[PDB]
C-alpha cells in the first residue's frame, strides 16, 4: 500500500535519473523491441525523447546535475513508451506462440 | 444487371495478382482486345 | 436450390445462395469508393483497398495473414468507382473463422499511424503496376474529362497525395461511408441464417445511409497526355445514361452493335461495324471498340480506338462517322438481333463464374434493391427496339463530348474538330 | 550616338549602339524557340538552351568556358516561346574575344553524344528549379490549353523527353532555325563594321528563312492542376491581338488599366481595378493582375488571380465581373490616361537597363525587321482611345475562353461556369 | 515594342543564376507580385 508507494518513490529518488532530467522510458535498454516501440512513437514524443537523452548526455559529460525544481518529481513522471513497448512485446509474443505450432 | 461490366471487355482494366491481400480495380469496357492480334 | 434475400432492419442486405460447392465465397459491397471522395481527400479509397490486411480491434495483421493463409483461403478489394467489394474465398469447412476476419476488416479497423505509414508507398508501387498498361491511365483521364465534381475522382491516388493519407482520414471515411444501409452480404456455399446472425454480430453498428455523395455533373472537356508512345490510346464519349434505366439497355445494344468484344481469337471482327468501317479506310493495325460505362448518377458511350501515331486522327473520324451512319437509320434488323444475342450471352457468361456471379449480386443489392433473376434481365434486353438503339446513337452524336488521349497525339484531332 | 541599323543581304540583321559604357554588350536573337517544335523534337530548343557551353568547331568546351571566365565575361541565353537569345557581356576591351566564342556557339555547334548525354540531366534540374514557383506551371498549362499547336509548347522539356533528345535533333534544329534571315546581331559598346565583320565571317554559311512552322491555332480549352497547394493559381485568358497592331496596344492599355501590377511596396494597388474590385468581396490574402501575352501571329488577354483555395471561384468571379463592367463602358477618360501613363513609364523603365535595351532591339529587329524610336511608341501609347480599350474588353468578355488551374481547387469554377 | 516583356512580372519568370553558361526563360505577366503582402 502506501507503504510501497514509499519505497518506490525513495528508489526512484535514489535512481538519479530524475536528476539529469531524464524520464523512466529513457534510460531503458535499447534492445530490439524498445528499437521498434521507439520507432511508433509519435513525432512530438520521439522528439522530446530525443531532447532529454541529449540533455543528460551533455549533463554527465560536464559532470553536473540539472537544478532541483528541474529535477523530474516522481508522481509526474510518465510512462510515454510503455503502451507502445506492451503492443510490440505482444505482437512478438503472438509470432513466438504461431511459430511454436 | 447493374455492374460496370456492362460489356465483359474493358471491365477488370487493372487488377494485381495476391493471396490474403489482393486489391483490384475495375474500369468500363474498354479497348485493347484485339490489339495482340495486330501487333 | 434458389438465392435468398433479405433487407434487415438497420437497411443492410443479405443475400445466400446455396449451391453446394466445395468453395465458399463470401461478399461484403459497400457503397463506398472514388466518387465518395472530395478534393481534400482524394487517393483515402485507394489507401482503403490496400488497408485491407492492416490490425483491426479484432484481430491483428499477422494474424489476419497468418489465419487466412492457413486455411488456403484467399481475401481480395475490387473497387469500382461506386462500390467496394471485400471477397474472401475458402473452403466451406472453414469459412466462419474468415467472415470473422471479413467483418473485422470492413467493421473495425484502427489504421495505426506506422502501418499507414508502412503503407503509403505501396500506392505508388499499385498506381504504377496498373499504369503499365495504357488503358488504365487513358480511361483515367477520361473520367476526369467528361464529369466534374464525383465520378471525375481517379481509382487511383492521385502522386501529391501519395504520402499524405492520414489515418484520420481512413478513419472518417470509414465511420461515412461503411453503414450499414451502405453495405450488402452477399454468399455463395452459405447458409441464410449464418450470415443473418454474423450480419447482426458485426455489422449492427455504424447505422444509416452515411454521408451523401454529390451527384455527379458533366464537364465535357478533354485530357491529352501526350507520353510518346507509337500507339495512341483514344476515347471519345459522351453522357449517355444511368444504369438500370431502359436508355441503359439500349446504350448496351448499341454498343454490341458497333462491336465491343473481340470474339473469335485473331479475327477480322466481321461484326464489329466500328473495325469494319474503320478497316476499309485505315490499313495500319489500329483495333477500335465501343465504350460503355453506366453509373447511378449517369454513364459515358463514346468509342475507344487504339491507333498509329501517324494515321490515329483518321481512324477516329472512321469510327466517328460509323456512330453517324446508325444515328441516321441505317441499322439493319439483323444487326440489332445479333448485338441483342452477343449482348445476353456475354451477361449470362458473366456470371457463370463464381466471381462473377457474385459481383452481378452484390451490384444489383447495392445500386438497386432486390435481386433480378437472368430471364427478366433477358427479356429487358429483348424488350429493346431499333428505334431506340437509333435513339442512342442519336444522343451520342447530338451530346458534347469528352476526349482523353494518349500518346504521340500529332495528329489526333481535338473535341472541337470532331 | 543613335542606333546603327542595318540589313544585310543574306537577310541578317546587325544594329549597333555606341553608348561608350566601359562594358559590352552583344547579342543574337533567332526566331526559334519552343513554337518551332513538332510533337516529334519536343524538347529540343530546351536542351539547346542549356547547350550554350558544349564543344563547337572553334573552341571546346573547356576551352570556352575558360575564355569567358577569364576575361570574366558571361554568355547567356533567354529562350522565350518563339525567340531564342543568346548574349555575351564584359569589357569593352575584351568583347571581341567573346564574340567568336559567341558565333561559334551557334553558327558551328558539334553535339557531341557523351556531352548531351551528360547534360540530359541538366533538363530536369531546370525544370523542377523553374517549377519551384506555381507560376511557371500555370502558364505552360495555360498556353498548352489555349493553342492547339506551335505556341502550346512549352519552354521546358516534357518529363518523358529528358533523356531522349538526340544529337541529331538538336543538329536539325539548329539547321533548319539557326538561319540568316532569321537572325539579328544587336551590340551595345560595338563599333558598326566590326560587328558587320563578324557577321560576314559567320553568320552567311547557312542560308535565310529556314523551316517556318504552322499558325498557331487558338484551342479554348482547359488544364485543371489538382496539387494540394494552400494557394490556387488561377489563368482565364481569351485570344487577343497579335503584336505590333493597335489593338495590341489597346490590349496593353486595357491591361493596365486593369493593373498589371504593384507601384508601391506592399501598397493595396488603389489604382488597380481589378484588385479593388475583388477586394470588396474577399477579406482573404489574394492577387489578381491582367495577363497579357502578345505574340507575333496571335496574342492572350485574361486575369491570373492567386487565391485562397475555399476562395478562389470568388476571386475569379469578382475579377471577370469587374472586366466586364469595363466591357460595358464603365471606363473613365483619367483611368485611360492613367494606364497610358503606366505604359509609357514601365517602357521607358523596361528599356533603360542595357538588358532591356538589349532585349528590346532585338525583339523589334526579329518582329518588324526595324527599329523604332521610343518616342514613336509613346506616339502609338497615346493614339488609342477609351474606345479602342472598350473594345478589347469586349473582345474578351465575348471570346472563347481558356483556362488553367493549379491549387487544392474544389472551389474552382470551369470556363463554362464563368 | 516587340518583345513579350509586357510588364515588369510574368517575364523573366524562371531565369536561373550562371555564370559562362546561364540559360533563362520568359513567359508573359503571371501576377505574384505583391501577393507576398499576406501569408
Known sequence: SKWLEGIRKWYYNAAGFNKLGLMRDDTIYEDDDVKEAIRRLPENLYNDRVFRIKRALDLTMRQQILPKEQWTKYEEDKFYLEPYLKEVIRERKEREEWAKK | RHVVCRFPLGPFCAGVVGHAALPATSESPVLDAKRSFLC | QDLEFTRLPNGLVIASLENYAPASRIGLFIKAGSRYEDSNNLGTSHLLRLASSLTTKGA????????????????????????????????????????????????????????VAALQSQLRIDKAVAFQNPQAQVLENLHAAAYRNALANSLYCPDYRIGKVTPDQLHYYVQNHFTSARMALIGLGVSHPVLKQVAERFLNMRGGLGLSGAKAKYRGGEIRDQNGDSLVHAALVAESAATGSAEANAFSVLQHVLGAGPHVKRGSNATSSLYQAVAKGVHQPFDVSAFNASYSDSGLFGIYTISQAASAGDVIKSAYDQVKTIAQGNLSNTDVQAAKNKLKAGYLMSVESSEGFLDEVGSQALVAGSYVQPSTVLQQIDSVADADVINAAKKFVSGRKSMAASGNLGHTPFVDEL
Open chain 3, 60 to 115: 491483428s495483421s499477422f494474424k489476419i495473414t497468418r489465419g487466412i493463409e492457413a486455411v488456403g483461403g484467399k481475401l481480395s478489394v475490387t473497387s469500382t468507382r461506386e462500390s467496394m467489394a471485400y471477397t474472401v474465398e475458402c473452403l466451406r469447412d472453414d469459412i466462419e473463422i474468415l467472415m470473422e476476419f471479413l467483418l473485422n476488416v470492413t467493421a473495425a479497423p484502427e489504421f495505426r499511424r506506422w502501418e
